[PDB]
Design a protein around this ligand. Structure first.
Ligand SMILES: O=C(O)C1=C[C@H](O)[C@H](O)[C@H](O[C@H]2[C@H](O)[C@H](O)[C@H](O[C@H]3[C@H](O)[C@H](O)[C@H](O[C@H]4[C@H](O)[C@H](O)[C@H](O)O[C@@H]4C(=O)O)O[C@@H]3C(=O)O)O[C@@H]2C(=O)O)O1
Length: 352
């Protein structure tokens, strides 16, 4: 199938960032204003009311009024709010655990997840509905936060175990569906890939892990000569948006895999790799004529402004590669639950 089909999970506690080293850095290192701005605010999470899971069938309206672009369905947002709160709190607690090392944040995360697990949340839905997508985002969000505390001894370990098993079932069920002519292969495929990768790690499920790495391999084969993703260039006014969107899960799969000794960044297909796609995002934002080759609509550029969660992937890549912030977007801190919370907090290092 692919070059990583014998890969195994070596360390289920390794997470998607070196938690101990990063914490040490946050507590002893010379922080700039940006990093200080990114420190999460402590609070007493033991008294906080967290979202309750939906009873029974997960029903979520379609996102787009019609098609896969244009105006948004007015019924969508009020419904996915519950999920976005679940995501926000999760990622916030994970980041607080990393920054402070206090077990209380871990216990808070586990109590919320345990409640969702006991309800069999994220399991009952129509695979052809919007719900199937919502699961890929919410399950990865939770897993990323949980992955940072897999080594913590001061928690209810039995509860930690039920939650991991639940996540494993969620991801196995969610990724068992192939998708359509697009969702088999487009950014959704990559999002399922990040889900399978991180949950495969924390649950020591080699097969889920391999399936997730396979999604990254699939993506590299769908990059045009210019660095554009084939399926993202069919989205009309959201083409540029979706080109960027695709980078989010691809980057987390690569970051997660590097903690298990795999270097997905180095992987390429016919001389094309993730760096080509980065270069194209940067170029096309400076010069949107580039997109005209694929779409004639004026591009929606809501994702391209300082502080947008959509830019979180830049935090991880620039930490690792050292390239230049050519668009001048890395000013304020970035926070995105679906890619592990604040990549500023977790990856960004000030530069001499
Ligand atoms: O990050 C911010 O700073 C931020 C500020 C704004 O106030 C607002 O909160 C904004 O919200 C984001 C939200 O955080 C998610 O990122 C949301 O994500 C979208 C994503 O942009 C795509 O539109 C995605 O598209 C799907 C679609 O849902 C269907 O599944 C379709 O069939 O396939 C596509 C696809 O190919 O992926 O849906 C996501 C979603 O609905 O969660 O976007 C909002 C936002 O409005 O930008 O962030």
């Amino acid at each position: 199938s692919h070059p990583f089909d014998q890969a195994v999970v070596k360390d289920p506690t390794a997470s998607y960032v070196d938690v101990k080293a990063r914490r040490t850095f946050l507590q002893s290192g010379q922080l700039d204003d940006r990093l200080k701005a990114a420190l999460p605010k402590e609070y007493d999470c033991t008294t906080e009311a967290t979202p309750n899971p939906q009873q029974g069938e997960m029903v979520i309206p379609r996102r787009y009024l019609s098609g896969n672009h244009g105006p948004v369905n007015p019924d969508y947002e009020p419904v996915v709010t519950l999920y976005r709160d679940f995501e926000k709190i999760s990622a916030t607690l994970g980041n607080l655990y990393v920054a402070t090392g206090k077990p209380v944040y871990a216990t808070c995360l586990l109590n919320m997840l345990d409640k969702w697990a006991k309800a069999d949340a994220l399991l009952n839905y129509d695979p052809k509905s919007q719900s199937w997508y919502q699961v890929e985002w919410s399950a990865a969000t939770a897993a990323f936060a949980l992955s940072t505390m897999m080594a913590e001894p001061n928690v209810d370990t039995a509860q930690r175990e039920r939650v991991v098993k639940w996540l494993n079932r969620v991801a196995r069920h969610q990724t068992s569906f192939p998708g359509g002519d697009t969702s088999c292969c487009n950014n959704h495929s990559y999002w399922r890939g990040q889900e399978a990768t991180i949950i495969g790690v924390i649950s020591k499920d080699d097969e889920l892990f391999r399936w997730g790495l396979g999604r990254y391999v699939q993506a590299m084969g769908l990059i045009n000569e210019d660095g554009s993703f084939v399926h993202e260039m069919t989205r009309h006014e959201q083409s540029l948006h979706f080109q960027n969107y695709a980078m989010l899960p691809l980057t987390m799969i690569a970051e997660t895999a590097s903690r298990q000794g795999i270097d997905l960044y180095a992987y390429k297909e016919n001389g094309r790799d993730i760096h080509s796609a980065r270069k194209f995002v940067f170029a096309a934002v400076k010069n949107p004529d580039l997109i005209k080759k694929y779409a004639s609509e004026p591009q929606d550029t809501r994702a391209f402004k300082p502080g947008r969660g959509d830019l979180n992937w830049i935090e991880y890549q620039r930490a690792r590669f050292g390239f230049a912030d050519e668009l001048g977007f890395m000013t304020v801190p970035i926070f995105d639950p679906r890619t592990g919370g604040s990549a500023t907090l977790l990856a960004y290092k000030p530069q001499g």
